[PDB]
Design a protein around this ligand. Structure first.
Ligand code: B12
Ligand code: SF4
Ligand code: SF4
Length: 374
C-alpha cells in the first residue's frame, strides 16, 4: 500500500521531468542545527539563509504530524551551445550555470505542484507542503539524508550520474514512506576545488565562508571590497569555479530540460549595453532568470567591475556619464573607480568635478580612489 504509492510516485515523477528522487524521515536535522550555529559563530553565513534556525531544522514544525520528506533533483546543462566570444571591442560578462534559462524556482515549483496534485488525486487525506519557493529547510541536508547525493568538499551535493550540476527541492508529506540510504562520499583525498577558489572562500572541506565567496559578492547591493574587485573577473552573477574544476563533473552536461537552455545573448551578454538598460528592458530580458531577483543594480555594478578588469577604454565615456548622471551612489562610485582603474589620465579632470559635486561620502571616497590610480 504505502510501498505501492511510493512506486507510483517515483514512476510518475520521472515521467514529468524529475531526474532523481529520494526519501527521508521528517525527523530533525541535529547535525545541521549545530553547523548553522557554528557557521554563524564564525560569521560564515551569507545572510540569505533563513534567520529562525528552529524552522530550518524541524520538518514537523512546518507540517504537523509529518512523517516523511520527498527530495527531488533536476540536472541542468553545464555547456552553452553556440556561445559568443568576448572580443576586444565587445567584452562579455558571464552568468553562472545556475542561472541559465528559466528560473529553477519556477521549474521546481511546477514539478512539486504536480507531485502534490498526484497525491491529492488518490484522495487519502494526504497533506503536503512544498519547501521550495521560500525557503526554510536546508535543501542540501534533505538531499543528503534522502540519498540524492553526498556532501562534497566544495559544500556541493554531488550525484554519481549528474555530478553537482543539479537543482534541489523537497516536499514534506504525512506519508509513512520508507527512507533511503545516504550514498558514499566519493571525494576521497582530492582537494582541487579548495585550491581553485579565487578568494579561498572554502576555508575547510565542506565549509564555506560566504562573505568571501564570489557567488555571494556578486549579489550584494553595496560597494564591493577592493580585495575582490580584481578577482570577480567577468562574472555578472554566481560562480561555477568549484564545480567546473571538479573531476566528478567532468563530462557532465545534461540537456534534459528545454526551458533550462541558456539564451547566449543574455547568459553571456555584452557588458557595455548593460550600463544603459532601463528597468523595463531589464525585466523583459533578464526577468525570467534566477539572477535577476535582486534587480539590475548589482548586475550593472559587476559589469562596471568587469569592464575595469578588461580595461575597456571604449567604455570610458559611458562610465563617465554614469558618474555624473546616475541616481545611485553605488553606480557613481564604482564607475569612477573603474575610470581610474582603466588608466586613461585624460579623464582625470572629469573625476575632479564629480568629486566636488558628489555628496554621498562613500561615492565621494570612491572618486578619490580613481584619481589616485591615475
Ligand atoms: C545561502 C545560500 C547560498 C550562499 C551560501 C551557500 C553555502 N554554501 O552555505 C551563497 C549565496 C554563497 C550561495 C552560493 C551557491 N549556491 Co546557494 N543556496 C543558499 C540557500 C538559500 C541556503 C543554503 C544554506 O543554508 N547554507 C548553510 C550551510 C551551513 O548549510 P547547507 O550547505 O545548506 O547544508 C550542508 C552543510 O550544513 C553541511 N554540514 C552539516 N553538518 C556538517 C558537518 C561538517 C563537519 C561539515 C564540514 C559540513 C556540515 O551538510 C549540509 C548538507 O550538504 C540554499 C537553498 C536552501 N533553502 O537550502 C541554496 C543552494 C544551497 N544553493 C545552490 C546553488 C546552486 C549555489 C551555487 C552553485 C550558485 C552559483 N552557481 O554560484 C553556489 C555554490 C557555492 C558553494 N561552493 O557552496 C543550490 C544547490 C544545488 C545542489 N545541487 O546542491 C541550493 C540548494 C538552491 C536550490 N534550491 O537548488 N548559496
Ligand atoms: S562559488 Fe566561486 S568563490 Fe564561491 S566557493 Fe566556489 S569557487 Fe569559491
Ligand atoms: S574537486 Fe575534488 S574535493 Fe572538490 S568536490 Fe570535486 S572531488 Fe570533491
Amino acid at each position: 500500500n504505502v510501498y505501492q504509492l511510493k512506486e507510483e510516485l517515483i514512476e510518475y515523477a520521472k515521467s514529468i521531468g524529475v531526474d532523481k528522487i529520494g526519501f527521508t524521515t521528517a525527523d530533525t536535522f541535529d547535525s545541521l542545527k549545530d553547523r548553522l550555529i557554528l557557521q554563524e559563530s564564525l560569521g560564515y553565513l551569507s545572510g540569505f539563509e533563513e534567520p529562525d534556525i528552529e524552522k530550518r531544522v524541524t520538518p514537523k514544525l512546518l507540517l504537523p504530524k509529518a512523517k516523511s520528506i520527498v527530495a527531488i533533483a533536476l540536472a541542468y546543462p553545464s555547456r552553452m551551445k553556440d556561445a559568443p566570444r568576448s572580443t576586444r571591442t565587445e567584452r562579455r560578462g558571464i552568468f553562472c550555470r545556475a542561472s541559465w534559462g528559466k528560473d529553477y524556482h519556477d521549474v521546481l515549483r511546477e514539478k512539486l505542484d504536480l507531485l502534490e496534485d498526484f497525491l491529492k488525486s488518490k484522495h487519502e487525506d494526504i497533506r503536503t507542503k512544498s519547501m521550495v519557493d521560500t525557503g526554510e529547510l536546508s535543501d542540501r541536508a534533505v538531499a543528503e539524508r534522502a540519498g540524492i547525493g553526498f556532501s562534497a568538499k566544495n559544500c556541493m551535493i554531488t550525484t554519481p550520474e549528474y555530478g553537482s550540476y543539479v537543482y534541489l527541492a523537497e516536499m514534506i508529506t504525512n506519508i509513512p514512506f520508507e527512507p533511503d540510504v545516504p550514498i558514499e562520499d566519493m571525494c576521497g583525498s582530492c582537494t582541487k576545488c579548495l585550491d581553485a577558489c579565487p578568494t579561498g572562500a572554502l576555508v575547510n572541506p565542506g565549509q564555506l565562508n560566504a562573505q568571501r565567496c564570489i557567488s555571494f559578492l556578486t549579489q550584494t547591493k553595496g560597494f564591493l571590497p577592493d580585495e575582490f574587485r580584481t578577482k570577480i573577473g567577468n562574472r555578472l552573477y554566481g560562480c561555477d569555479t568549484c564545480q567546473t574544476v571538479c573531476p566528478l563533473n567532468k563530462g557532465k552536461d545534461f540537456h534534459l530540460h528545454p526551458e533550462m537552455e541558456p539564451d547566449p545573448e543574455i547568459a553571456k551578454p555584452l557588458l557595455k549595453p548593460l550600463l544603459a538598460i532601463s528597468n523595463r528592458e531589464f525585466k523583459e530580458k533578464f526577468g525570467h532568470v534566477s539572477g535577476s531577483w535582486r534587480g539590475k543594480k548589482p548586475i550593472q555594478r559587476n559589469a562596471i567591475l568587469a569592464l575595469a578588469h578588461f580595461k575597456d577604454a571604449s567604455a570610458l565615456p559611458e562610465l563617465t556619464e554614469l558618474m555624473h548622471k546616475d541616481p545611485r551612489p553605488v553606480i557613481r562610485g564604482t564607475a569612477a573607480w573603474a575610470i581610474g582603474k582603466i588608466g586613461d589620465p585624460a579623464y582625470a579632470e572629469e573625476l575632479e568635478k564629480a568629486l566636488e559635486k558628489e555628496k554621498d561620502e562613500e561615492a565621494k571616497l570612491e572618486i578619490e580612489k580613481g584619481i589616485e590610480l591615475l
